[PDB]
Amino acid sequence: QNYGLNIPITGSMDTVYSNSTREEVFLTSTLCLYYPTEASTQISDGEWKDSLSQMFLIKGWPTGSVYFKEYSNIVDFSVDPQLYCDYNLVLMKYDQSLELDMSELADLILNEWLCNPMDITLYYYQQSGESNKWISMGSSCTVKVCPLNTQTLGIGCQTTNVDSFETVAENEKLAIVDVVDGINHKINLTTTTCTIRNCKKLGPRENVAVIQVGGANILDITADPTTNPQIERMMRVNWKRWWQVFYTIVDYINQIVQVMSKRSRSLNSAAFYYRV
Amino acid sequence: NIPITGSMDTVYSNSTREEVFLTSTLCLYYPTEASTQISDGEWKDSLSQMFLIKGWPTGSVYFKEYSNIVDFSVDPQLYCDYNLVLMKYDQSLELDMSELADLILNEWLCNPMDITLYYYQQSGESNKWISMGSSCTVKVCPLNTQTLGIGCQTTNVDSFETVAENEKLAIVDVVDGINHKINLTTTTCTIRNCKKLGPRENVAVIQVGGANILDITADPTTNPQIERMMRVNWKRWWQVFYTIVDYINQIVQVMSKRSRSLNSAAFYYRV
Amino acid sequence: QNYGLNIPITGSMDTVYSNSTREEVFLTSTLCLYYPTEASTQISDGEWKDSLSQMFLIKGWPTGSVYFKEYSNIVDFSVDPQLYCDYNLVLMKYDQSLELDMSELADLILNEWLCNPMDITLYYYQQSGESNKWISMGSSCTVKVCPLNTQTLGIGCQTTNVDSFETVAENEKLAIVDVVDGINHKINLTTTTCTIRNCKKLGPRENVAVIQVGGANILDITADPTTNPQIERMMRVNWKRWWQVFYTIVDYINQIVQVMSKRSRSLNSAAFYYRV
Amino acid sequence: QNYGLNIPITGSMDTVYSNSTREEVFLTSTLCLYYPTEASTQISDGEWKDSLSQMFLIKGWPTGSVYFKEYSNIVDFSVDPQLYCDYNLVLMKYDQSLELDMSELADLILNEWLCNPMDITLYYYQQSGESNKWISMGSSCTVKVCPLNTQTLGIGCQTTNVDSFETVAENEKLAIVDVVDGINHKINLTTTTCTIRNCKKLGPRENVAVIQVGGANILDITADPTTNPQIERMMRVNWKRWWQVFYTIVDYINQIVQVMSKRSRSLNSAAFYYRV
Amino acid sequence: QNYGLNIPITGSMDTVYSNSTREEVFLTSTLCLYYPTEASTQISDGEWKDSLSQMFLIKGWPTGSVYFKEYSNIVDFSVDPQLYCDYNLVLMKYDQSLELDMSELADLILNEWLCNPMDITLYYYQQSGESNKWISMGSSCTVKVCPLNTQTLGIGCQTTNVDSFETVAENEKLAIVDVVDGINHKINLTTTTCTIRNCKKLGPRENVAVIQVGGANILDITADPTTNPQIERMMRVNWKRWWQVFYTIVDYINQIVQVMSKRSRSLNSAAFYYRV
Amino acid sequence: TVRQDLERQLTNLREEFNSLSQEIAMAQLIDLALLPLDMFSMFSGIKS
């Protein structure tokens, strides 16, 4: 049996609101932070995890519910970001020249992706439509594509001479690459380090929220240029002191989780649905 | 303070722009960089004569130089009836500019704090602590219910956790409902327990440089863009001032008169 | 060629009509991409225009429809910009301190301007209303303005001592200068090199869509401080490879063109209507 | 005002019609003479500009309304003839061997042209039909076209061998080339000096009027060899002294503007078609 | 498609069946086989992948739809076994003293586990009920649990002495440890080389079936001592030759897939519950 | 490659056909339906 997917739910416009649920969502869910190593370095502590946990307890979350996680930086977190955890808040420090990789990480974790494998050395690969991308993750993802015409001969590049291949993203830990949809391609991607998946983009992973810490709003989650929507799960707070940032988070946690949702969680901590 | 009632079939009154121009005062705050680039000193008078054709009487436009953002943050007075504040944008000044904007655009009602004696909570969302002085260093130790520090010893000061250092202005929010012991530089820096009332309509902030960075709301979820936070693209301060004078009608018409019955006498430039 | 200018149209709401105009003084719609020369330098190619033409053919645009008009950089493109086409795209690589130049160029091309000559030597000049600006164009412009009075005595400046003047812009290829509307101004501007035009702002131009490539939303085309509205033609995209940028534009060209509009085109490729 | 939409105009047949508009055109428009350098040299003067302006004002043009412009000669003026003005007169001295140059200059200016751009080294080009030409302008245009059969193989030429190409205009400053319509072509022309544009002829340009000064009727502007109309805007004079030429023009300036009319495209009524 | 809600379906007990779906499950899914390296060692061949694939095709499975995945052995495969695939079969050569390890692996893979992190260093943990366990995975897991009083004092152990702590699992790759429910515990587990997760037992994972190639029925997936059931997906077979084992698999693959079924959590039906 | 690669061209044909279905007349389409099209007649209407 389905859960009732194709059955309508007749409601009403006079039923009275059921009462609050903040208490129950606190007592069930688990809040969870992803912060850079710079945060701990500037805090210069090591009971700060305990202090923040007790602050969250006073705010109304039971003890074993707030889990802190540490990543070296944005680009290195981008390599297979496994959100091992229920309500995800990714604190993310802005610095120049990280605009694109920061945006790519935000896209990857905010949206749900259905990823299939790709065998680069053997087959050519297209992109079906607007919602499909190629996501390449690893230690050194240099991607060089050669598009083929109707005659299986490359255009602007010969399939034999890899130098003529058009490089589309060099030396990123994560690269979400789009190419014109409907052309076969030959990819030269460094198979020892980097792995590349053909990923469709389903709806939004409406569980993880991204808190930018530095500059102006720049996260273009939608790769299409005509639209730059602003999701309520993309927050932006100025800063000088990481302690002030964490106190702001702890003080306003209720609003943040009210913005986020719990139902959109997956059994796997992976940030995509691998469908072989 | 009373129910005011009025029909919808009332006809419009004549435009009140003339009366507000002939009764109220506009007052600009600009950084000393502006004067330095201008390299003049009859420019104040020339700009006043230039405002006159726009409508303001001879004396109703008042210019008040300030050195820079960090120095203007300390206890900013607003001696006027329509205040414009020009804020140059530059890197690393984002939060200080946002803090100054949060201080002036919003209207705070607030009381003093005796840091050496008591422990101070934060009642709710509105209540912040405003630290102002030559150089503030707000160290805070949060206490458990047993009046013992968590992640800090109430006696030792090193274990305390800095939330703002070497700041001429610091608007700090701590976790609500937790007692706090502050160590704060009693000589240079005073600190005030301040609640956020409605908006201050008397003022308006022209950012002079970059992108949307002002965040008047300390909350992360909401980053609203109110009408009084303008931004203009600058390359010459003369061009900036010409723009402001030419479009003064819209700026003043986006501002509004202050509505808060204060009880603390202060100097105002009313004519 | 409308000349039933005044009399009104009538059109029903509940009916989709199968009758419609079939107007054609064309062969087909034509697209034209302006890009900085550094794009070519990074690409390090020279059949890449042909490859992009082939990929546009894949996306549906006929072969002779897409053109590429290289420009050296934003400031040098600002001097008498030309719209040689029907659907214009302009790629603009953002950099620090180029913000006002970039915004002024975007304002110039995006809006529609009605310009008149300005003989600085003989006459004083004025700005009648808010819609009127002065545009200085040339290889080297240095605008100095001395406002006058009713008595025609300079204020903050002597009418003859040019050094007493006030400089609103210097050493810019393009300068869209607004002065206070109502006061005569005596101008001093380097007549041998830079020209000045007294231009009113008509409605918006639609052939041009501006694809910013770098930083956050900073283009304030509207000289009014209060209003900073992000219209649908000021698109933005993050980047690290010009191949990625161009593939993005090719993939989403249909959305871009259906955001733009062919109708508001002009015979001459000048960015303004010069009425002598 | 319902721009960009053809709307029928219902006109009566017995409404008494308005009074004259000559006062309006004199007190509003701007007359705009173009004369060759030889005229000034023979006149041997240079207050003659002021003298003619006074003699114009006698007949009732405001002082700034008359606007004199000086061009070196026919062939060098024809390159990019930019008639940005309100009521243009163009004096063309006839001499032998300049028949086609004068004819193509008149063809270029008397009619409004919509010019799409061309990229010679990348595409092949066609002519839609009767009204589509290719207009080439520059310091030295030497356009060598050669046609292609349906198999993309040249006829009368080898595509790779430029020596086999069939030159159709050499070393002309302006060349309005018409080739056989419906045949793809490959072009070569000296891209550094001479530019070329695929130009379609719209209706006539009422703004301009060509006074041929010298010999008999030679201006066959219509590229069709059969029709050879003598449009009202192509006037002729017999001359010995440029003073006599200018005196005739000033004395009969009213009739000239009666022949001419305001540029239709420049009107507000043509806002959203090809306004110029 | 009305995801998330639990709507009550309704069906009639007199409707008729539908056509068999055997064709679809062969022609769309992907079969997936895990075997120990000793299999290939005894096979001593190496187009046997192709041979098995062609036999599967004869049974009805397209060529590219059957995957083989050699694993070293049970203990080293149990460390985070990721079955990113569509119809999973896991062969396991039973051996003495690996009874618990094999049963732990079977319990881990044959049921859907919802796992949250566990910060050993900071919190004290608990077990909500019989459906909760702690799975530890790594190169060498040595879990030492110290239960606590109601006043956070250990019983049978001191909270400061890992020597006094009681060892529950020692130096195994996979350890699904259960403890008393309702008693807080303090853990020490070698955090640099063995992660631990607090996991909850959802319904069964039909996607995967286990085949014990060796001895007698021992797999007790249910950690409860009382119930030691025999699930349909826990198959057993005797053996002397790996070729014979694989031929049996291929011959009866339709029956094995009938025993299994598509993962309940891989479908859009389970979208907003715990989809993965 | 992973399959044949004219499905893109078929998709373009579909996109144009769907909009092209509106410009069809009716009264003298029914007579075309009445007429027997055969192998000889069907494909003779190609463009060139």
Ligand SMILES: *[C@@H]1O[C@H](CO)[C@@H](O)[C@H](O)[C@H]1NC(C)=O
């Ligand atoms: C739900 O909340 C309302 C809030 O007033 C309260 O009255 C009610 O008792 C609550 N429901 C239950 C079952 O207690």
Ligand SMILES: *[C@@H]1O[C@H](CO)[C@@H](O)[C@H](O)[C@H]1NC(C)=O
């Ligand atoms: C990519 O090209 C390099 C060039 O040396 C080659 O070594 C490598 O094997 C290629 N990789 C793929 C996946 O084609």
Ligand SMILES: *[C@@H]1O[C@H](CO)[C@@H](O)[C@H](O)[C@H]1NC(C)=O
């Ligand atoms: C207000 O406007 C009306 C018409 O708009 C005018 O008749 C009236 O005189 C105006 N009021 C005053 C005080 O002049």
Ligand SMILES: *[C@@H]1O[C@H](CO)[C@@H](O)[C@H](O)[C@H]1NC(C)=O
């Ligand atoms: C802050 O700490 C210093 C030393 O840690 C101390 O001398 C000073 O009195 C403290 N501030 C206050 C207000 O007590």
Ligand SMILES: *[C@@H]1O[C@H](CO)[C@@H](O)[C@H](O)[C@H]1NC(C)=O
């Ligand atoms: C469309 O216009 C034609 C005449 O132009 C008219 O006969 C017809 O009724 C109109 N309405 C339609 C086609 O729905």
Ligand SMILES: *[C@@H]1O[C@H](CO)[C@@H](O)[C@H](O)[C@H]1NC(C)=O
């Ligand atoms: C601008 O000022 C200079 C003085 O340095 C003067 O020589 C020049 O003539 C002025 N320009 C014009 C157009 O008068």
Ligand SMILES: *[C@@H]1O[C@H](CO)[C@@H](O)[C@H](O)[C@H]1NC(C)=O
């Ligand atoms: C036309 O003539 C009448 C009578 O002489 C006069 O009143 C009217 O103003 C004239 N029209 C114009 C446009 O001068």
Ligand SMILES: *[C@@H]1O[C@H](CO)[C@@H](O)[C@H](O)[C@H]1NC(C)=O
């Ligand atoms: C035209 O032909 C000459 C050889 O006669 C060649 O050098 C030149 O590059 C050609 N021009 C173009 C634009 O290809």
Ligand SMILES: *[C@@H]1O[C@H](CO)[C@@H](O)[C@H](O)[C@H]1NC(C)=O
């Ligand atoms: C079901 O299968 C039978 C033969 O196995 C076939 O004849 C029938 O058409 C199938 N049902 C449908 C709906 O095609």
Ligand SMILES: *[C@@H]1O[C@H](CO)[C@@H](O)[C@H](O)[C@H]1NC(C)=O
């Ligand atoms: C576990 O005990 C060892 C000593 O045997 C100790 O070094 C280690 O820190 C303990 N682990 C944790 C997580 O405290």
Ligand SMILES: [Ca+2]
């Ligand atoms: Ca290449």
Ligand SMILES: [Ca+2]
């Ligand atoms: Ca990336």
Ligand SMILES: [Ca+2]
């Ligand atoms: Ca794509």
Ligand SMILES: [Ca+2]
């Ligand atoms: Ca976008």
Ligand SMILES: [Ca+2]
């Ligand atoms: Ca500050």
Ligand SMILES: [Ca+2]
């Ligand atoms: Ca501390």
